[PDB]
Each structure stands twice: as C-alpha cells, then as structure tokens.
From a paper:
Based upon crystal structures of [name] of [name] (CYP51Mt), three of the thirteen active site residues, Y76, F83, and H259 (numbering according to CYP51Mt), are invariant throughout the [name] gene family. To verify this assumption, we determined the binding modes of second generation compounds containing the N-[4-pyridyl]-formamide moiety by determining their co-crystal structures with CYP51Mt.
Compound 7 was not found in the CYP51Mt active site in the crystal, which is consistent with lack of spectrally detectable binding. Compounds 8 (3-{[(4-methylphenyl)sulfonyl]amino}propylpyridin-4-ylcarbamate), 9 (cis-4-[name]-N-[(1S)-3-(methylsulfanyl)-1-([name]-4-[name])[name]][name]), and 11 (N-[(1S)-2-[name]-1-([name]-4-[name])[name]][name]), were observed bound in the CYP51Mt active site as predicted, through the coordination of the heme iron via a lone pair of aromatic nitrogen electrons of the N-[4-pyridyl]-formamide moiety (highlighted in gray in Fig. 2) and interactions with the invariant residues Y76 and H259. H259 hydrogen-bonded to the carbonyl oxygen in both compounds, while interactions with Y76 were mediated by two similarly positioned water molecules. The residual Fo-Fc electron density map suggested two alternative conformations for compounds 11 and 9, designated by pink and cyan respectively in Figures 4A and 4B. Together with the limited interactions of the isopropyl moiety, this lack of contact explains the low binding affinity of 11. In both complexes, a portion of the BC-region was disordered and missing from the electron density map. Although racemic mixtures were used for co-crystallization, only one enantiomer of each compound was found in the active site.
Numbering used by the authors: 3 to 89, 106 to 216, 222 to 234, 237 to 449
Write the structure that this text describes.
Amino acid sequence: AVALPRVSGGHDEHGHLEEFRTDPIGLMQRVRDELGDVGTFQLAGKQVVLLSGSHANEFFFRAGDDDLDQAKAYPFMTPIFGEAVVFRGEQMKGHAATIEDQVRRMIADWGEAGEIDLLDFFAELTIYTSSACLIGKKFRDQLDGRFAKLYHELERGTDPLAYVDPYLPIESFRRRDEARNGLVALVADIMNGRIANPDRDMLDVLIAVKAGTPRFSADEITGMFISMMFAGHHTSSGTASWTLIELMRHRDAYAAVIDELDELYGDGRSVSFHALRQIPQLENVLKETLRLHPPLIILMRVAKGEFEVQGHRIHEGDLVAASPAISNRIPEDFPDPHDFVPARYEQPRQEDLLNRWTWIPFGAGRHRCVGAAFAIMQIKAIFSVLLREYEFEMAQPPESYRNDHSKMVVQLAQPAAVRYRRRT
Ligand code: HEM
Ligand SMILES: CC(C)[C@H](NC(=O)C1CCCCC1)C(=O)Nc1ccncc1
C-alpha cells in the first residue's frame, strides 16, 4: 500500500509520458538524482520502476523469465513484426568477409572526395550487412535503397505513445503500417522474380515449405525477415555512426587507430582474419562510444511477482526498467563519466569488466547480448575498410551531432554531415 518514491513533474495528461517522448534521458537521470537506485515515473496508466546502480542492476539482470518478463514489456513491436511473429563461431569469418564486401560495395561510387550523411550511409549499409549475413547474399543482392527507406519508417513507428495504444491515428503509426505493407510488396516482387528468373538462401528455404499449397505468404515471410533483422539494425547503424563521430572528435584516438590498422594489416591477412582478432585502440574507442551512446537507453520488463530491492517493494505487473544511458555514466563507477576516455578499458583499468552490473551497453547476466561478438566484429570490419581507404572530417560543429530520442528506437539525428577524401 506504500507508494514507491515518484520522480518530480509528470503533471501532463499521461503523467511522465510526454517528457519520456521528448527527453527520456533527462527524465531517467532525474529519477536517479532525486530518488537514488529505485524510483518511479508514470507512463500513462503504467508505473515504471527504474532501477540503477550496481545492486539494483544485478537484481534486474540476474532475474529469470519467471521473475521479470521481457517480451510482455514490448507490446508495441506487434504491428512491426506482424500477427504471426509470436515473440556461430564457424560462420563468423565468413560474415566478416561478407561485411567487408558490403562496405566496399557501399563506397564503390565515392570517388576521390565527397560528403555523406552518417544516418543515410550507416542505415543503408547495415541493411545490406544484416540481410546478407542473416538471410543470404542472394537475398541482399535483390535489395536496394527502397528496403532501407521502408525499414527506417518501421523503426520510426515506435513512439512511446504506443504504450497508450499502438494504433492511435497518428502519422508515425500510419507510416509504420504503410512501411510494413511496402516491405511485404518488395518481398513479394522478389519471390515473383525468383519464379521467373531462376545457390540458395533462407528465402528459398521458406518458399519451399508446403502447407501442397505453399505454407508461407509474402506477409509471413516478411515478418520473419523484419524480426530477424531488427535487433542488430538500428543498434549497429547508430554505433557505427557514433564510432566515426568520436574518432573525428578525438583526433589522437583516430591517429592511433590509423597507425594500428596500418601495422596490423601489414601481415597481409584479410579483414576476415583481422576483424576476429584484437584491434586494441579501435576496440577501446568502440567500448567508450558504447558507454557514452548506448543505442538501447532503457530496457523494459514486466514483474511476474513480488520482489524487494533496497527495501522497496516491486509488485507483479509493475513495469521494471534498467538504463544503460544512466548506468553507464554513474560517476562512482566511471571516473569522469562524461569524458571520452578509451584508456579506461586498457588492462590497468578494465572499467567494463570491473563494473559488471553498470557497464551495460550490451546488457548483463541472463540477458547479455547474444549479438555482441557479431556487432563488435562488424565495427572492426567496417572501420578496417573505411579508415584505410578514406580520411574523414566533420562538416558541421562537433557538438552538433546528436541522437533523436523521440522514439523507443533511438536514431542519429540529421544533419550528420561528414566529408571524406581518399587516403594517400
Ligand atoms: C551494437 C549493437 C547491439 C547493442 C548495443 C545491443 C544491446 C543489447 C542489450 C542492451 C541487451 C540486453 C537487453 C535486455 O536486457 O533487455 C541485448 C540482449 C540481446 N541482444 Fe543485442 N544489441 C546489439 C546487437 C545485437 C545483434 C546484432 C543481435 C542478433 C542478431 C542481438 C540480439 C540480442 C539477443 C538475442 C539478446 C538476449 C535478450 C535477453 O536474453 O535478455 N543484439 N542486446
Ligand atoms: C528495444 C527495441 C524496441 C527492440 N526490442 C525488441 O525488438 C524486442 C521486443 C520484445 C523482445 C525483446 C526485444 C530492439 O531492437 N531490441 C534489441 C536490440 C538489440 N539487442 C537486443 C534487443
């Protein structure tokens, strides 16, 4: 009957929802600043118990699906995956080679010098890497920029208003729904193309299954492919963007990465060899970029039961959340937490390893990211190519690069303009 501590503000119609839709990171920080390790905010009719700090995070991440339910906290993903999506080491070398090929293909028309937008570039690139690795090169080769454009609209369909109702007549939801129909149409044209113009991939596997009448429709197959690509797409896309931004903002780090790439590749081995082995300075830049710009800024659960955390009672049906955005910057755990300090991961400090429950850009415990090794390899492969072929400079003030946090799916904001010039 005791109310949990509640953060200030949230006097709008849906409580803190409006703030969560505009500045979720400031809201979550205020929870911690006012209340400490366990505090709440109101998301429309739902209480969110926001945990932070080592002890509370440990509870969150060590909880089994019996205690804290992940999938129930994401009902808004239903219109994205669709009705019927009811939610290896031996391959990695091949995937690194695939990634190298996709990056070379993306920069093939760059020429001597030019300008890119990082969101446009990395969003499209990572559609190709994800589709090629997860579904097949044959399928990627039947994709072009339209698939990326549509997939982006789908991701933009995750306004937190979806916690009120995911089918409200707002434009972002209408565009989410239309984008999904557009993706189904692309997949149907691909299926038809294969009939008329017959080396196999997962799409071939799915087409072959019989109910015989074919078992799966374009709609069903498309939902499967959307779901397969979702976790790794915006996360990898944003991380690649922020990696390049932070290298440009910190030229000393950029210079060290260049030297090391040039030294490492001097053994004559491929990207598929080196992307699976240490590239130390780049890896520490990546760790720091993830600490500062975690693409998942909040992680949601529904409590299945009663638990106590620091003498605060969580009850069944409470939404319960952790936040990499906030936890990754706890100043007692990460000295100078707003500063970009790749040295914090060198053997002497290992701040990622020592702070097991608060360095959480890839989660922790029971829910440690199963895609982390792939995502890390993919950054290594991408930058092994980009940084050896081209030099990059910022085309706008360094502090003006920023994320759009208005949707549950975080995206780099535009402009994110960067110039390149061939390395001599
Ligand atoms: C840089 C890219 C990525 C980041 C920052 C990231 C982040 C995370 C985070 C924060 C969690 C914990 C989720 C939670 O506790 O609710 C997680 C778990 C997970 N991620 Fe990722 N992820 C990335 C890429 C990927 C990729 C490429 C895949 C696979 C295609 C993937 C699949 C998963 C899976 C299967 C889990 C386990 C969920 C659980 O058991 O709790 N992720 N990831
Ligand atoms: C947070 C996003 C809305 C999105 N979440 C999801 O796609 C799932 C919803 C239900 C099952 C858990 C996650 C997502 O991209 N999640 C992940 C991305 C990565 N790695 C792990 C999860």
